[PDB]
Design a protein around this nucleic acid. Structure first.
Ligand SMILES: [Mg+2]
Ligand SMILES: [Mg+2]
Ligand SMILES: [Mg+2]
Ligand SMILES: [Mg+2]
Ligand SMILES: [Mg+2]
Ligand SMILES: [Mg+2]
Ligand SMILES: [Mg+2]
Ligand SMILES: [Mg+2]
Ligand SMILES: [Mg+2]
Ligand SMILES: [Zn+2]
Lengths: 38, 176, 94, 136, 135, 134
RNA sequence: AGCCAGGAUGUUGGCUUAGAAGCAGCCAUCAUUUAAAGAAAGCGUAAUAGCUCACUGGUCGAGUCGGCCUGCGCGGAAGAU
RNA sequence: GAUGUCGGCUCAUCACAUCCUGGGGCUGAAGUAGGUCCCAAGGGUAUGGCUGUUCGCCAUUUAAAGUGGUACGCGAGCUGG
């Protein structure tokens, strides 16, 4: 999981999702692309 | 919205009981009961089920959409039924059913025993295959996740409890 | 043919102009010829969309000031320092 | 790194940085990077931004730098008390008012100019906007 | 992205060749590789046939000008046209061997004499010989 | 099922065909002499392509194809090796009569309907190898 | 948007390399059968294979896409009795 | 018209920017062992050689030998290098 102030889509398979008031990047193709704003 | 506006066809021999926000859908395969959100207004009429937002409720269409999707798979439930298929991969990994309990050999010191809930039923066509059957799409999905949880597919050989339809990406170990 | 709708200005100066811009409008002037200059007010969004078309600065425009039609040409434009907005337009009578 | 070749005087009063900019239009290129905020750009910041946009366009096209760091900025070293003269000149800045076209570019497609300008914007202490040239 | 200027142009090309040709075959071309296609596009130009995959909305428009205004109900599912310009027949036989040899698709409906030919009675234009047989 | 290019009068060495076709399940001596018995008509010093179709019983059937487009453009222009940077460095020259000579042989493998269609397909193989039409 | 089908030929483009066959690099980037298919957006192979995208035909049946001027919010946000 | 200074002893108390132990994501994570990030302050967190030293270097331990605040905590509590 990457925790940073600036979360972005990294590839086409990346998806931005707001779970529990926290912007997140979920990705089907690369687990390295997993992000949490914080 | 597009989901909510789409009506759910209630077939022959399927009973729909609607006491306010409580819906009981009875068929050949079983009896499922659900409580809809107060923003959903469910109308019976003919051989269909129609969903729509309730006045003064902000997320009405989002709520009716969910209600629709649920009641559809409730009907498909008490009629056709749902099937989840799991397959055990790895030397020594075996499974067997003894009534309402799935016995599992998954590489631990102690053998795993999993108590199935009301409605979910399992059968083992092989020592390495588990087939689950039930009416509640949520419960069957839960049980299959819990059984997978014991030994999740490892990324280096694919060993562990996997879903039949599951694509298990593997990888090479560090070079040197 | 670009058609612009305008009102004559009831007020002049810093105060009145800033007030216009606050109301999604802007001042502009029509000068040239024997006729005395005419201080007018324009809808911001309308003239902003027009001026985006290159042809606006080359073509002969028609300004409808209380029924009367005025054939003009865009002389000079005062733009907002950093926003995509218009502050003032000079229209010369053609 | 930009800096005046000579100066009438070494040091300059702090002054103030009030008002709106002069040089608010793309005057040489097709595209520009315009200042939306107020502040000081240092010669090092200007260079960092210029390098970033130059890499971006793979040295194709032409770049103009509409700003010049001509204000000397003095600094008093550590463990030095107040007074005893004005500090020594350490670096050079260009005062920026909102509206200033900072850089200009031509000879490259809009999509690339927009990229190159996003990359340079990241190195600057003030908020910027992309601007295109206009007919009057 | 097909523009209307380009949609009208495709309607025009297939409207022109509609009048000119004699017999036409409307068929499915699903699950067949381009290797087998470039093969049926070779033996198609040889037999004096015009091969085209045309959008079914676009085809219902370039066939409204008749005599194929019974090929309407054949513009449901993927459609390829075999317009036989030089000598009637050729394709109605070229396709029948391609259908049996590849097992994929079924061949929809054929058109000749300005009359409807169903999926069962395509044996009429498949047994016909040459022009060029009467002598 | 593998695609290879073997010489007109040569098929046997270990570095090009050896462990390339022999790893699947094809006889190294049965194919090497049956291929050269049919490619005896094909001129000396011309790479000719051959496609292999193998079954579950280790058996094989091959259909010989016409020489490649980048292969026939080297003998017509008078070059052993092409250009390292095509359309930047010129290595030879081929006339409009030589272009139609490569296409009239390649007609069995070409997708084109007309002579002009097969000619333009060889025009592209020439530009992307450094050769200029003169 | 989803789902069904294709995503080809010359050709394994040329150079290089034990091999480079769209997929280490470097250079060019046309042409054909075309409904459409980059001399190929990424993963995979010792190199091939094999999987998918750009693009296009079918199904569906009414909306859908993302820039601009703006109001109010969200994350960015760790300290000692 | 006086708020005793460094270090040690004794005795502590808080923060968490966590040293160990606990949970957990990614890894260029096969295992063992690491790297990095998130959650977590409940408890635990060396003895010596040299030097007034705090520090530091060194020896040998340990699961670990945390980082800081408390008048750089603590002389109407001790010491006085
Ligand atoms: Mg949670
Ligand atoms: Mg005032
Ligand atoms: Mg006193
Ligand atoms: Mg913390
Ligand atoms: Mg780090
Ligand atoms: Mg503690
Ligand atoms: Mg240790
Ligand atoms: Mg103290
Ligand atoms: Mg005392
Ligand atoms: Zn991703």
């Amino acid at each position: 999981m990457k925790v940073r102030a600036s979360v972005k889509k990294l590839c086409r398979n990346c998806k931005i999702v707001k779970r529990d008031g926290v912007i997140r990047v979920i990705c089907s193709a690369e687990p390295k692309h997993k992000q949490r704003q914080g | 919205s597009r989901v909510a506006k789409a009506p759910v066809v209630v077939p022959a021999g399927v009973d729909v009981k609607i006491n306010g926000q409580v819906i009981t859908i009875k068929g050949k395969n079983g009896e499922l009961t659900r409580t809809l959100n107060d923003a959903v207004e469910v109308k019976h009429a003919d051989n269909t089920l129609t969903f729509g937002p309730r006045d003064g409720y902000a997320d009405g269409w989002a709520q009716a959409g969910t209600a629709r999707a649920l009641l559809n798979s409730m009907v498909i439930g008490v009629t056709e039924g749902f099937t989840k298929k799991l397959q055990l991969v790895g030397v020594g990994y075996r499974a067997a059913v003894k009534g309402n309990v799935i016995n599992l050999s998954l590489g631990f010191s102690h053998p795993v025993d999993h108590q199935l809930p009301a409605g979910i039923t399992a059968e083992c066509p092989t020592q390495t295959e588990i087939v689950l059957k039930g009416a509640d799409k949520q419960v069957i999905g839960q049980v299959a996740a819990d059984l997978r949880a014991y030994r999740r597919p490892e990324p280096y050989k694919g060993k562990g409890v996997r879903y039949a339809d599951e694509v298990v990406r593997t990888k090479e170990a560090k070079k040197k | 043919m670009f058609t612009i709708n305008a009102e004559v200005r009831k007020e002049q100066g810093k105060g009145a102009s800033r007030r216009l811009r606050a109301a999604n409008k802007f001042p502009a002037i029509i000068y040239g010829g024997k006729e005395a200059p005419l201080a007018i007010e324009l809808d911001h969004d309308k003239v902003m969309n027009m001026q985006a078309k290159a042809e606006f600065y080359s073509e002969v425009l028609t300004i409808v000031v209380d029924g009367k039609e005025i054939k003009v040409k865009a002389q000079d434009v005062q733009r907002h320092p950093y926003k995509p907005k218009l502050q003032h337009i000079d229209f010369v009578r053609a | 790194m930009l800096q005046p070749k000579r100066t009438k005087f070494r040091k300059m009063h702090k002054g103030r940085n009030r008002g709106l900019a002069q040089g608010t239009d793309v005057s040489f290129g097709s595209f520009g990077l315009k200042a939306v905020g107020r502040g000081r750009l240092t010669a090092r910041q200007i260079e960092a931004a210029r390098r970033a946009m130059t890499r971006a366009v793979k040295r194709q096209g032409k770049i103009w730098i509409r700003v010049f760091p001509d204000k000397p900025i003095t600094e008093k070293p550590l463990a030095v008390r107040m007074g005893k003269g004005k500090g020594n000149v350490e670096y050079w800045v260009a005062l920026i008012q909102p509206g200033k076209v900072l850089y200009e570019m031509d000879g490259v497609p809009e999509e690339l100019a927009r990229e190159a300008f996003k990359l340079a914007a990241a190195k600057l202490p003030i908020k910027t906007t992309f601007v295109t040239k206009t007919v009057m | 992205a097909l523009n209307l200027q380009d949609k009208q142009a495709i309607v025009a090309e297939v409207s022109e060749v509609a009048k000119g040709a004699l017999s036409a075959v409307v068929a499915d071309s699903r699950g067949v590789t381009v290797d087998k296609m470039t093969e049926l596009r070779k033996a198609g130009r040889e037999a004096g046939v015009y091969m085209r995959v045309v959008r079914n909305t676009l085809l219902r428009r370039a066939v409204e000008g008749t005599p194929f205004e019974c090929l309407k109900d054949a513009f449901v599912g993927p459609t390829l046209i075999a317009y036989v310009t030089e000598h009637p027949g050729a394709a109605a036989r070229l396709f029948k061997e391609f259908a049996k040899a590849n097992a994929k698709f079924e061949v929809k409906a054929a058109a000749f004499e300005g009359e409807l030919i169903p999926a069962s009675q395509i044996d009429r234009l498949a047994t016909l010989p040459t022009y060029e047989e009467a002598i | 099922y593998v695609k290879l290019q073997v010489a007109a009068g040569m098929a046997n060495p270990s570095p090009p065909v050896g462990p390339a076709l022999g790893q699947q399940g094809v006889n190294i001596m049965e194919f090497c002499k049956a291929f050269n018995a049919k490619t005896d008509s094909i001129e000396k010093g011309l790479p000719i392509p051959v496609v292999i179709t193998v079954y579950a019983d280790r058996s094989f059937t091959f259909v010989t194809k016409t020489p490649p487009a980048a292969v026939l453009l080297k003998k017509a222009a008078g070059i052993k090796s092409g250009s390292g940077k095509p359309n930047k460095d010129k290595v030879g020259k081929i006339s409009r009569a030589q272009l139609q000579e490569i296409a009239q042989t390649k007609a069995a493998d070409m997708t084109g309907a007309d002579i002009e269609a097969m000619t333009r397909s060889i025009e592209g193989t020439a530009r992307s190898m450094g050769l200029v039409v003169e």
